[PDB]
């Protein structure tokens, strides 16, 4: 579950930076 999650957390973690950056 290394890259399978780094990709699962990164994307989701990104939905916030963008949903938060504005």
Swiss-Prot record:
Keywords, comma-separated and alphabetical: Amidation, Antibiotic, Antimicrobial, Cytolysis, Fungicide, Hemolysis, Secreted, Signal
GO CC terms in record: extracellular region
Compartments, record wording: Secreted
GO biological process, one term: defense response to bacterium
Sequence positions bearing Glycine amide: 22
Expression tissues: Expressed in mast cells in gill, skin and gut, and in lining blood vessels in the viscera. Also in intestine, spleen, anterior kidney, and blood cells.
Function, in words: Antimicrobial peptide with broad-spectrum activity against Gram-positive and Gram-negative bacteria as well as against a variety of fungi. Rapidly inactivates channel catfish herpesvirus (ED(50)=4 uM) and frog virus 3 (ED(50)=13 uM) over a wide temperature range. Seems to disrupt the membranes by adopting an alpha helical conformation and forming toroidal pores. Has hemolytic activity.
Family designation: Belongs to the pleurocidin family.
Protein name in the entry: Moronecidin
UniProt source species: Morone saxatilis
Region of the whole protein represented: 23 to 44 of 79
